Design a protein around this ligand. Structure first.
Ligand SMILES: COc1ccc(Cl)cc1CCN
Ligand SMILES: COc1ccc(Cl)cc1CCN
Ligand SMILES: COc1ccc(Cl)cc1CCN
Ligand SMILES: COc1ccc(Cl)cc1CCN
Lengths: 237, 300
């Protein structure tokens, strides 16, 4: 059924599962036409498909050419997402195929269920958690590869860098969601926290900075404060 | 006009024949129903007074035999029987008519209600849905499950309606996933009409039989099937124009025959508010939209 706080450790068991977030698939800028009307211009997007146990991220880049001449693009974007996730599953060896796919938005359920009819044993589930995966495009290197794409492309990342050498998957996912929640709440301040230090660096093969364990505690606490400080800001507290 | 003689009425029961019903008291001198219009299927239905639980009955065609009702006190239900002695039967009927022990099928001459509810319903098709081939009539009751219900338990007692599942490989062409899910024309026209039902008459027959089973008995599997067959049409962008006009007439007489007290429980909100107001055919059911709104304005 639905994934929530109560069955949260299930994310880190040994049954392969993927989260699928479609927020960033169809991305537009709304603007005015010469005649004083409103139009949209699309920009490249991405499907965010993440194994929460291993940190493996299948970033399918959605190039704006896929929208050319199509109508009802918000609706199509859900079915395109479902088509591409199904293609990903079919591309994986059987022992790598997920047993469950958890969509972050319930409107993905029927499109993904329909595209996965050939996979009756793969459970398609919603979640009651508010996950901050929309902020994936705040990670500089993911945003870079998406905007530079000139054609459809899949790029593989480990969104946990090397953290699983030192922390558990549960803790890595908690660090990830905190970071992304901070970037979603106040992108500018979150990035200031991550990068203001001229002594700290991101490895060429990593997404996040190379923090010692103690520095991560400092960073994590600064992210918590940011989320609390922003809460007071927007809700007057 | 044909006759169905009763050997007696030993237990208090409400007896129906098509849209008519009447109460018979325990051991009242009831010996059956006369003046039954030839040319249509009929259904003779029962609900015992001492246990309204379990409505049951028999679909039959007087053109296919001489049928009588004998109460069975072991199985506790009014059973339909075929009578060999062709003139045993005629002599059985003539005796009770002469003693005026039968009720007359009370058909008003203006009234096409029964024809309109059974236009496409034929005994031959009923008997493929209800599988008991040693009798010429078909038993149905409140509790019988359908084949699709049995997939989601006794198969011989099943209603073998055609399975309809909108999230199924039968319904969805590889590579037309969004197209086929959002527009069910492929599934309606190619899979169901051309492939399975052969024509719309057989489709409407099953649709009408499903409605009558759900309405007359309280058969939940039957209501499910009726809803599904309506939804499959309304959710198809491409439907022959003769089918849309006929569907409108079919449903008009159903929702209208349907006593108001059964509407609260029998009618499914998502299936109907979609068909009338959101579907491709939302504008193609004028008569049917005119009967529900007239008698159900609270709904919308
Ligand atoms: C004495 O037998 C009868 C009386 C009434 C009725 Cl309807 C039928 C029968 C036929 C018995 N096979
Ligand atoms: C009087 O006929 C009936 C009796 C009982 C039930 Cl259950 C339904 C009907 C339908 C009549 N449209
Ligand atoms: C939803 O309940 C119903 C709908 C239709 C019919 Cl005919 C019967 C029921 C109640 C029996 N389960
Ligand atoms: C009188 O009840 C109704 C009338 C029309 C429609 Cl569509 C549905 C219902 C029952 C609602 N659960």
């Amino acid at each position: 059924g639905a994934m929530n706080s109560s069955n949260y450790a299930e994310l880190f068991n040994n049954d392969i599962k993927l989260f699928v977030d479609d927020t960033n698939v169809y991305r537009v800028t709304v603007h005015k036409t010469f005649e004083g009307n409103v139009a949209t211009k699309a920009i490249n997007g991405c499907i965010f498909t993440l194994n929460p146990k291993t940190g493996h991220l299948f970033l399918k880049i959605i190039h704006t050419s896929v929208w050319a001449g199509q109508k009802r693009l918000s609706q199509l974007a859900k079915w395109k997402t479902a088509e591409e996730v199904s293609a990903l599953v079919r591309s994986l060896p059987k022992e790598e195929q997920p047993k469950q796919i958890i969509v972050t938005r319930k409107a993905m359920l029927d499109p993904l269920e329909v595209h996965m009819l050939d996979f009756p044993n793969i459970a398609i589930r919603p979640t009651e958690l508010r996950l901050p995966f929309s902020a994936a495009m705040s990670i500089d290197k993911l945003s870079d590869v998406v905007m530079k794409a000139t054609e459809p492309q899949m790029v593989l990342f480990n969104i946990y860098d090397d953290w699983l050498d030192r922390i558990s998957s549960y803790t890595a996912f908690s660090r990830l969601t905190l970071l992304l929640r901070a970037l979603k709440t106040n992108e500018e301040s979150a990035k200031m926290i991550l990068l203001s230090d001229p002594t700290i660096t991101i490895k060429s093969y990593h997404l996040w900075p190379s923090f010692t364990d103690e520095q991560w505690i400092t960073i994590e606490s600064q992210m918590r404060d940011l989320i609390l400080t922003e809460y007071g800001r927007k809700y007057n507290v | 006009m044909n006759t169905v003689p009763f050997t007696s009425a030993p237990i208090e029961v409400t007896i129906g024949i098509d849209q008519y019903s009447f109460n018979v008291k325990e051991n009242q001198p009831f010996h059956g129903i006369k003046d039954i219009p030839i040319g249509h299927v009929h259904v003779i239905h029962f609900q015992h007074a001492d246990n309204s639980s379990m409505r049951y009955g028999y679909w039959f065609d007087c053109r296919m035999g001489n049928f009588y009702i004998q109460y069975d006190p072991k199985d506790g239900l009014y059973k339909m029987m075929e009578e060999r002695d062709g003139a045993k039967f005629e002599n059985i009927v003539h005796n009770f008519k002469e003693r005026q022990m039968m009720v007359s099928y009370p058909k008003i001459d203006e009234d096409d209600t029964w024809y309109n509810l059974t236009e496409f319903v034929q005994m031959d098709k009923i008997r493929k849905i209800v599988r008991k081939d040693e009798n010429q009539f078909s038993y149905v009751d409140s509790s019988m499950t359908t084949v699709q219900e049995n997939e989601l338990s006794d198969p011989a007692h099943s209603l073998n309606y055609t399975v309809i599942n909108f999230k199924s490989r039968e319904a969805i062409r590889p590579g037309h996933e969004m197209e086929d899910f959002l527009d069910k024309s492929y599934y309606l026209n190619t899979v169901m009409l051309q492939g399975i039902f052969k024509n719309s008459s057989n489709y409407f027959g099953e649709l009408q039989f499903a409605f009558l089973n759900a309405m007359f008995f309280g058969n939940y599997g039957s209501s499910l099937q009726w809803h599904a067959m309506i939804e499959l049409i309304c959710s198809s962008a491409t439907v022959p124009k003769h089918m849309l006009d006929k569907l409108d007439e079919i449903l008009y007489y159903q929702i209208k025959t349907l006593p108001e007290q059964y509407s609260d429980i029998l009618l499914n909100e998502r299936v109907w508010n979609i068909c009338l107001y959101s579907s491709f055919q939302k504008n193609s059911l004028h008569n049917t939209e005119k009967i529900m709104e007239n008698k159900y304005p609270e709904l919308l």
